Amino acid sequence: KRLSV
Amino acid sequence: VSHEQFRAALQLVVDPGDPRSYLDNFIKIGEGSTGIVCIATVRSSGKLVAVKKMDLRKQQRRELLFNEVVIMRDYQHENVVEMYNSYLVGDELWVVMEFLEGGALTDIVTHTRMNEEQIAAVCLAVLQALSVLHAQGVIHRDIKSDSILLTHDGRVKLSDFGFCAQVSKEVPRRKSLVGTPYWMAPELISRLPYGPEVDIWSLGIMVIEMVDGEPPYFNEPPLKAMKMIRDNLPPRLKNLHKVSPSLKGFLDRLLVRDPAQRATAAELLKHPFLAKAGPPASIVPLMRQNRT
């Protein structure tokens, strides 16, 4: 997943 | 934690009014970590702008939205997406900014092969941005191909500052767990105090994106990848036979576990690998509108 925390 | 308390604060720092009074035909083009991005048409002129829309209620850390205003007001640059105006629109913060019509680097690294002239041109452009940001105390903290935008003519610009932070003599290190798992520096995952070096590590990972098409451990779940970044040796290219020794030597100054030993943006601009850098025209054929 290329999703920032 | 009052939503309406935070709306009031935002209202004091953003520009007054509603940009729908001069923008037409909003069309969603992207989705980020803190909101969505739309293309809009300036009614009077027909020019296109970009509009980042961020719902105050969907933020994990609402106070990071101020980063968007802090960067707009004080840190413009050639290789940094320009932000024009901010607005409070209902429950959303809207930033009207430059439209980077060539899209994100991600669409390129996931669909085609970059040669080293193109890679060196990307790295040079990103390092010019970071050398100026770092010099003024600003850490990006979310460097990855998704954060690199392109003009139609191949110019490269840094975007998505929603997670940045400032350091200074009074606050020399940050401690916050921030970023995207596969791209995070080891000292950051280790919860150590860190500085601008974490951007240099993240750029290394992005170099691996441009060579391999994906960051290391991308097949592993995000938390497992972070543990492997934390404890294992620096991640290696899957295709080491496909990089010039110049590129490998550059990458070795990037993916150093000890942040004191990592090269800085200022030093990297002197590295021989960046002499391979081509002009922006060399990136143009990589973009979707020009590929086959």
Side-chain angles (χ1 to χ4, degrees), chain B:
Chain B
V1 281
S2 215
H3 171 70
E4 284 290 352
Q5 178 154 350
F6 211 89
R7 286 187 71 252
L10 261 179
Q11 185 71 84
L12 294 184
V13 311
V14 305
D15 303 298
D18 184 334
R20 266 164 320 174
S21 70
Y22 63 90
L23 295 186
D24 285 320
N25 285 10
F26 289 75
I27 307 172
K28 185 175 162 172
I29 62 174
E31 203 137 18
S33 335
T34 59
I36 68 162
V37 183
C38 296
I39 294 169
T41 300
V42 176
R43 184 167 320 120
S44 68
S45 72
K47 268 189 171 218
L48 304 185
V49 297
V51 186
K52 190 160 170 187
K53 302 179 181 184
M54 291 150 295
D55 194 320
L56 276 44
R57 302 166 293 176
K58 306 194 180 212
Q59 306 306 304
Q60 293 177 335
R61 274 185 73 189
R62 252 147 34 192
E63 81 265 14
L64 291 165
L65 295 180
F66 281 125
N67 291 339
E68 317 272 9
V69 163
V70 155
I71 277 277
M72 174 165 76
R73 292 195 173 200
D74 297 302
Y75 305 94
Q76 309 81 33
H77 181 276
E78 273 126 17
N79 300 316
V80 164
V81 179
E82 212 176 354
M83 292 137 285
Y84 306 132
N85 291 103
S86 49
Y87 306 92
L88 182 62
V89 186
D91 299 309
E92 297 173 356
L93 172 73
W94 290 16
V95 179
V96 175
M97 69 209 262
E98 190 185 4
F99 177 43
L100 273 286
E101 62 281 343
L105 180 63
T106 297
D107 181 75
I108 288 170
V109 311
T110 64
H111 291 104
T112 191
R113 295 195 148 90
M114 303 181 62
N115 60 29
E116 301 206 355
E117 160 173 44
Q118 300 158 331
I119 298 177
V122 169
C123 291
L124 169 64
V126 169
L127 281 165
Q128 294 175 327
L130 289 184
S131 67
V132 176
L133 288 165
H134 295 177
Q136 298 192 277
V138 176
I139 317 169
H140 187 280
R141 307 205 289 183
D142 206 20
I143 299 300
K144 55 181 173 172
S145 62
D146 318 60
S147 298
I148 307 307
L149 305 191
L150 285 66
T151 75
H152 80 276
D153 49 294
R155 253 166 307 128
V156 173
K157 302 194 195 213
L158 245 198
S159 206
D160 300 309
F161 286 76
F163 288 167
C164 64
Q166 310 193 268
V167 290
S168 68
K169 217 86 183 164
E170 276 304 310
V171 197
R173 312 312 252 171
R174 310 297 318 195
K175 313 161 196 290
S176 292
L177 182 60
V178 152
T180 308
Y182 311 95
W183 287 262
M184 293 176 182
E187 70 268 25
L188 194 153
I189 299 163
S190 283
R191 318 314 322 279
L192 290 176
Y194 58 85
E197 323 81 45
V198 307
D199 279 348
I200 303 311
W201 177 279
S202 293
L203 171 62
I205 301 301
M206 187 173 86
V207 171
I208 289 182
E209 275 192 282
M210 291 184 276
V211 173
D212 288 347
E214 67 206 340
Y217 320 119
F218 200 54
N219 273 122
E220 298 292 14
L223 301 163
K224 184 150 162 223
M226 284 167 55
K227 191 161 170 292
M228 304 178 76
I229 303 169
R230 185 176 73 202
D231 311 335
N232 295 324
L233 304 107
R236 306 142 341 183
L237 284 158
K238 253 4 240 144
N239 301 150
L240 167 42
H241 53 298
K242 285 202 215 167
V243 300
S244 69
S246 187
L247 189 152
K248 186 49 163 48
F250 180 76
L251 183 69
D252 282 351
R253 307 284 308 107
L254 292 187
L255 294 175
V256 184
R257 281 186 48 89
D258 192 326
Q261 307 301 308
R262 215 166 299 145
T264 69
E267 299 165 346
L268 288 164
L269 284 172
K270 297 170 40 112
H271 195 273
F273 169 73
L274 296 183
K276 286 160 133 80
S282 59
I283 315 293
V284 178
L286 290 170
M287 289 185 276
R288 171 170 296 285
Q289 63 268 17
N290 307 317
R291 303 200 279 265
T292 293

